[PDB]
Amino acid sequence: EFSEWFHNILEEAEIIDQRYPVKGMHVWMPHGFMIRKNTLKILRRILDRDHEEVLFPLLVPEDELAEVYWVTHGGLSKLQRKLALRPTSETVMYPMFALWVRSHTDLPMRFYQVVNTFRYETKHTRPLIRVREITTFKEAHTIHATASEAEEQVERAVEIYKEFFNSLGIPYLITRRPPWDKFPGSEYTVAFDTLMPDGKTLQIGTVHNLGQTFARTFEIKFETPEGDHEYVHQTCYGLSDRVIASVIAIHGDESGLCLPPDVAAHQVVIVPIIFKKAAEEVMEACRELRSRLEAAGFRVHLDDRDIRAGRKYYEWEMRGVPLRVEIGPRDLEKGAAVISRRDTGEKVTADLQGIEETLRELMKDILENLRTRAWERMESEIREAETLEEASRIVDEKRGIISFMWCGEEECGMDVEEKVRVDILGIQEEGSGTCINCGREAPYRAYLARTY
Amino acid sequence: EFSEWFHNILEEAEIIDQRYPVKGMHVWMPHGFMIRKNTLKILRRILDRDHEEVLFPLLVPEDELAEVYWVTHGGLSKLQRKLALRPTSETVMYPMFALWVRSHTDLPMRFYQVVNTFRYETKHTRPLIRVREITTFKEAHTIHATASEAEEQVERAVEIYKEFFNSLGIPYLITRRPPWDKFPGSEYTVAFDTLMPDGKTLQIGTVHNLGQTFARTFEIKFETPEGDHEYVHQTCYGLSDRVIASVIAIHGDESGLCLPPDVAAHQVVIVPIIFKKAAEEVMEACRELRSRLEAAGFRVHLDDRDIRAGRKYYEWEMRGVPLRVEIGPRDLEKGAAVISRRDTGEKVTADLQGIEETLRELMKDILENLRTRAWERMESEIREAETLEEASRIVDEKRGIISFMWCGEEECGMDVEEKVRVDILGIQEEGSGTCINCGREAPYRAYLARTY
């Protein structure tokens, strides 16, 4: 199944090593780390346009807070106010925000940090999808003057995760979580969901619109042009390692890892073909290619090693390198080489002259291609239902996502869950109809699925 | 004094905010973070030549270990094996290294990670120099086949910290810590020390040469060409935030922060001078300068704002920007502008044509200049002494570093410390003489000082 493929590739391409002396704490190995490093480069290059990165501490006071790991002793000495490994920054980024805000001249403000978080759980240990220590977790907070601009932010926020995701070539379904699932205290939480190969659903990003609710709890006032003092309007949002998890799974494959060009470890890998004849001329030619690519902004690599070229083909291919460039005596003379893709298999033949541009184009192609395929496979698993019994049938038989109309009342909604044993992703305001369950007027389009 | 200058600048240039609800945990603000981000870019660009970055977890088992914060409960449930916030990775990067090594074909190996560490202390809270949570701590570990190559690594390691430090323009004194200070279990630890403005000494980097000592404790064997199994030779080394601390202090100044060009937030800042006359032509000209610099690899900024230009001068100058470029009507016509330095004050006048190169040169200059000055001020605080009473006199009167000859026996050494109330930095094998204390033969050149 998928679950087996997944584990086996993590270990084979050396992404993470699970053999750590504690369940739920995993080690990033060289290759894995590299992919994560490039994934973050993309993310940060977007955020950094109008956001400011910072970095708060790891421990949070028992007091300020009012399944969380607790720090009690400082050796053998019991301390006098317990310290907790950060659940979510809420409790202490805020009190401080109180001190930074004191004039409508200050607002708006947009911060974010990439930190690690903790959650104490049992009976559920799934790699990169559910652990005890979430190594890569980006969270952004924003402060505003008017209740309107808050909502405008929520929109911008969304257009941001779209761009990010589009770059990883990942499909998504944007809805609006039900009030029993929204973020505690928030006005309303919005969610990004994507489909896994095992026909289940993964949450890969949320945007929350708090109110003045927290502003009040922690006292965050700002004096106005009219010389008064009102609380601020704020919003937060974040995404985790799951993003990395999905990029591996979604663009799966039988050969192994297949990755977007700006996420792979190396974009291009140059393999030389030699058999003792003209060896000296082939190499001296492979170099003039690497150094020419490096000094052009290319994450390039040259496999110097002494092994059966056929094997080199295997390794770099299971690992995820997009484009492979082969050089042989024959092609040498003419002044050209062979270029093998990864998403397809097609090996064309281009001239070593304007090769720099041929490669850039091929890269663009590969993404677009991988992206499309991706949406086709998802859209086709979104089926409609009009009778609760029609749902169960489909859920149990074709997994995937299930579309339907819903009244929107709580009870009605929760009973759908208990009968079908599913979770309601969220609404999407659209034309009327009649609820798939209680029959009354249904003013919303909703979704269901089995989730991670 | 220095201590006051320091705090006041941290707050004024918004580097870190100390007002956190716990003593010893501080918050990196936007500006501070930026400096740290660029400091790490330099560091990583060197390490990445022959090292491989990774990332282990934060918690370590009470068992595997055998003033450290302890995690006991998982809510209200007491756990069955306490978890400790990582003192040093030793205890769990190693057991894992055991599994990664199994053939002399595998060695050598060179890893490293940039993580956060913890230490529970009291009565000593000094910003960036001594805290509870060390946010930026780089640590590298290496595994080897022969006991010789281990030592070769120790040498390379050193030549690496030299290059790093030279880039920050920081002076250092390399010695070899005394056996009562070396790293527990190691054969011998080497140290890098630098002088603070308050005439005290700061440790800014160590290199340790463990042996087979740990290899044995954790079982790290590798099978040989001769088909046998011997333990490995390993070495570790690291540096922390102190590095950032020193760069601020060493290149101090009355105006404020003065920084190396590759460490400052912005390398260049363009200020436009306008008074309602030809305003439209001055701006349209300042832009053609920013976009021309950005697309040339320049961390540039344009102060659009509407405020008294004299103030702009103050802000960017207290913050640390190296070069300021001013544009006015007069200079506009001619086709040139004014460029003000930061280390000096000198404002030259160059032509807007080949300005790209004039700036690059000026940057090179500023570093070299700042570096030199730096060593002059340190070397001059290293005074010699021949009688214990001559030491005390100088230490108590001119602070600084004190040179002398030493026999090298422990007792003798420790008694020097207790009588003069100082710490012995380390030896430096050189010609003989007679010990400043016990009179016997002194085969080593040693150093003393009051430290942080």
Ligand SMILES: [Mg+2]
């Ligand atoms: Mg639920």
Ligand SMILES: [Mg+2]
């Ligand atoms: Mg001592």
Ligand SMILES: [Zn+2]
């Ligand atoms: Zn209903």
Ligand SMILES: [Zn+2]
């Ligand atoms: Zn002596």
